[PDB]
Structure formats: structure tokens, C-alpha cells
Amino acid sequence: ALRGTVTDFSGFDGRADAEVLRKAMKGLGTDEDSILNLLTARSNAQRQQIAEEFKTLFGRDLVNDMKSELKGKFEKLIVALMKPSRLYDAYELKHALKGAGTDEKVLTEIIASRTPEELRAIKQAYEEEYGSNLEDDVVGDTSGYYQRMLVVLLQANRDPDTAIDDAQVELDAQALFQAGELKWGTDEEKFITILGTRSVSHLRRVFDKYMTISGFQIEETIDRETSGNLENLLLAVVKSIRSIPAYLAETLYYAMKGAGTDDHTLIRVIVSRSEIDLFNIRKEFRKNFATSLYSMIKGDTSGDYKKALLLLCGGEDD
Ligand SMILES: [Ca+2]
Ligand SMILES: [Ca+2]
Ligand SMILES: [Ca+2]
Ligand SMILES: [Ca+2]
Ligand SMILES: [Ca+2]
């Protein structure tokens, strides 16, 4: 079902590759093309093996060397590609929190689109790497029901997918109806519990039943009932329940649709999903936005940065 755009290389030789990277950086100047051509053709696991061989052969750190040779968005792109898979999400999260300011956009995006299984691994990796508890960190940098919704999600305790209970579907749809449209003000607590803990298959049925009952799609009520970060979060949650690929395909579009480009988001989504469901994200992009992701990046980016991006994403038609 799910498909990424990057797979393991067949005739992989970590040692051979490491020598190619060395030659590509040794001397005056850099062969950015040889770097990008090699790294976007190997799985993340293979990139770790290459960095390992590089160290044993030359006693130098591959990532630190590249950080010295490359610059701009390209460096940032390659540096993200080198980040171990099980650590990247935790890395993005730690950096959205840290500092004096917080990047709620990143928090919302990662916590809402990642499955409980992924949330549990991210929490582990986060703790072992930065010696801090993710929840404790988020709580400290957030507040209100936004913080609450995040904590609920961080529990990775979503109900399992079982046979759907129609009466329960009716009960939940009517409950949401009463907590929002029929209420003076909003009962955010009810939205948080239902959206945050019910199984995926169940909620999909609740979304349809709620539409039949209120004449509104749950998304419209959310926009009518809430505001700020909580609104964005809840929209993200509903979107992902419907389809993670589609929700991610949407945050990419808005990262480019604007005049400039949100390189941080573009890099993050493409890299983080390259070996998960990036192929699915591509289809959903064309289906919902008329253009392929390829052509969209092709015109919003440039340099080796643009080249690496298109090689990872690929597919001119979707
Ligand atoms: Ca050099
Ligand atoms: Ca640099
Ligand atoms: Ca209301
Ligand atoms: Ca609003
Ligand atoms: Ca643009």
C-alpha cells in the first residue's frame, strides 16, 4: 500500500562509495554533483554504512566534512539526508521546541501525522539523544487545549481498529454535534477525547455520519468553532485520519504555493517520508492540485538543491 521513492541500492559497496565521496571533496572546490548523485540513490541505512566506511578509511567524519564543503539549502538538504531515520523526527521536534521560540507548525505536523507506533519510537529516540522527555518538553513550551491535544496524541494510545459499532458511530457524531454547533461556545474537551483516542476506521465513519447529521463536514465546524493553534492541530488530525499522504501532500503545496518557498518544510517532508509513503504523497498531490510534485519543485527551487530534491522525489507526471 504505502510506498516511498527511495530504496536500498542493489550493488551497494559502502567502501567504494566512501572513496567517491572523498575524491569529491578532496582538494580545492567540491564536486556537489557527485555527492548529490550518490546520496540520493542510496537508502538511509546505506548512507549510515557509507559514513562508517568513510571514518574507518580516512579517519574523518563524513557529515562534518560536507558541512564544511557545502552551504545554503543544499547543505541543509544533504545534512538531513544523512540523519538516521529513527532520529530525524526527534531531531526536528527538538529543534522546534528549543530556543526562546517554538515552531508549532512542526509540532502540529509531526505529532498529528505520525502513527502511535512512530510516536513511541520518536519518544524513545528523543530521550536517549537529548536526555529529556518529549512530553515534558512540549508541555513546557505550550499551553491551553493545544498543549492538551498534543499530550493526548503523545500518549500513542489511540484505540485499535476493530469491527465498527454503528450505535457508537451515531453516539460520537451526535456528541460532537452537541459539543460544537449546538453549544454556546465549545466543549473542546469532548473534541479532544473523541478525535484523539478513537480508532481511525471508527472516526472515518463518524466524519461521514456527522456530515449527514449537521450538513457540515467536521472540518467546517472546526473552523467555525475554534481558532489559533488548536484549530490548525485539529484540522491536521482530521486530515491525517482521512489520509496521511493527502495531508502531507497538502502541507507541501502550501510550502511552495506562496511567493517564496518554505524550504524547511519542503526538506523535512520529502526527506522524512522518502522511504515511507512519498510515492503516495505524489499521487495525492497531482489528484488534488492538478500538477505533479516534480514540476512544482522544479519551478520553486534551484541549484544542486533543486537537483537533489527532484532526484529524491522524481516522477514527472506525478
Ligand atoms: Ca575541498
Ligand atoms: Ca557551510
Ligand atoms: Ca459553538
Ligand atoms: Ca477559525
Ligand atoms: Ca513559489
From Swiss-Prot:
The modification N-acetylalanine is found at residue 1. InterPro entries: Annexin, Annexin_repeat, Annexin_repeat_CS, Annexin_sf, ANX5. The modification N6-acetyllysine is found at residues 67, 73, 76, 94, 98. The modification N6-succinyllysine is found at residue 287. A motif ([IL]-x-C-x-x-[DE] motif) lies at residues 311-317. Annexin repeats lie at residues 12-83, 84-155, 167-239, 243-314. Gene3D superfamilies: Annexin. Keywords: Acetylation, Annexin, Blood coagulation, Calcium, Calcium/phospholipid-binding, Hemostasis, Isopeptide bond, Phosphoprotein, Repeat, S-nitrosylation, Ubl conjugation. S-nitrosylation is induced by interferon-gamma and oxidatively-modified low-densitity lipoprotein (LDL(ox)) possibly implicating the iNOS-S100A8/9 transnitrosylase complex. One of its GO terms (cellular component) is neuronal cell body. Pfam families: Annexin. There is a cross-link at residue 26 (Glycyl lysine isopeptide (Lys-Gly) (interchain with G-Cter in SUMO2)). There is a cross-link at residue 26 (Glycyl lysine isopeptide (Lys-Gly) (interchain with G-Cter in SUMO1)). The modification Phosphoserine is found at residue 34. GO terms for molecular function: calcium ion binding; calcium-dependent phospholipid binding; identical protein binding; P-type calcium transporter activity; peptide hormone binding; phosphatidylserine binding; receptor tyrosine kinase binding. GO terms for biological process: blood coagulation; cellular response to gonadotropin-releasing hormone; cellular response to lead ion; negative regulation of blood coagulation; negative regulation of prolactin secretion; positive regulation of apoptotic process; regulation of flagellated sperm motility; response to calcium ion. It comes from the Eukaryota. Belongs to the annexin family. Monomer. Binds ATRX, EIF5B and DNMT1. This protein is an anticoagulant protein that acts as an indirect inhibitor of the thromboplastin-specific complex, which is involved in the blood coagulation cascade. A pair of annexin repeats may form one binding site for calcium and phospholipid. The [IL]-x-C-x-x-[DE] motif is a proposed target motif for cysteine S-nitrosylation mediated by the iNOS-S100A8/A9 transnitrosylase complex. This is Annexin A5. The gene is Anxa5.
